[PDB]
Amino acid sequence: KKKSGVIPXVXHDCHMNXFQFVFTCCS
Numbered sequence: 821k822k823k824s825g826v827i828p829x830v831x832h833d834c835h836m837n838x839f840q841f842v843f844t845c846c847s
Contacts, residue, residue, distance in 0.1 A: 828840075831845060831846075832845060832846060832847055
């Protein structure tokens with residue numbers, strides 16, 4: 821949906837760690 825997902829590691833595809841929300845949108 822965005823065009824800047826790789827540094828923070830948001831959503832669910834760039835990583836599995838998580839960030840901010842760290843719930844639902846992460847995994």
